[PDB]
């Protein structure tokens, strides 16, 4: 599974619609498993993961030490496994977090990228990974 996390990031990186991405464990150590280098999501720490998976009412989470704003949250639902946010700083950009059996996939679009494209791209990656048991 470790190599595959990097393959997912590589695939995202080739697409000019996205600005940032990371895959972070949520089961055990909560370390960053793969990330686009030298951007915000590479800095996600365990204390940022726990509120996302625990607090039903999370609204202004810190992600890589910057605030984001939650506008839909079905992250812990087994059928949807996705949350939608906006950055809480300029330029306002769309974010989707999708949940596999063991990891969170964070994806940020450029400001011009549609909500649909970020959602479908992030969630489809999670759908594929879930089929492997990860």
Author numbering: 0 to 133
From the paper:
There are no structures of proteins encoded by the MPXV genome other than computational models. The A42R protein that is encoded by the gp153 locus of MPXV has significant amino-acid sequence identity to eukaryotic cell profilin proteins. Proteins from the profilin family are actin-binding proteins that participate in the assembly and regulation of F-actin. The VACV profilin-homology protein (VACV A42R), which is 98% identical to MPXV A42R, is a late-expressing viral protein with a weak affinity for actin. Thus, the role of these highly conserved profilin-like proteins in the poxvirus infection cycle is unknown.
Here, a 1.52 Å resolution X-ray structure of the MPXV protein A42R, the first MPXV-encoded protein with a known structure, is reported. Here, we report the structure of the profilin-like protein A42R, the first structure of an MPXV protein to be deposited in the Protein Data Bank (PDB). Although the structure detailed here was first deposited and released in 2014, it remains the only protein from MPXV in the PDB and the only poxvirus profilin-like protein with a known structure. A42R shows structural similarity to profilins, which are cellular proteins that are known to function in the regulation of actin cytoskeletal assembly. However, structural comparison of A42R with known members of the profilin family reveals critical differences that support prior biochemical findings that A42R only weakly binds actin and does not bind poly(l-proline). In addition, the analysis suggests that A42R may make distinct interactions with phosphatidylinositol lipids. Comparison with structures of human and bovine profilin proteins reveals significant differences in functional regions, indicating that the role of MPXV A42R in the viral life cycle may not be easily determined based solely on our understanding of cellular profilin function. Overall, the data suggest that the role of A42R in the replication of orthopoxviruses may not be readily determined by comparison to cellular profilins.
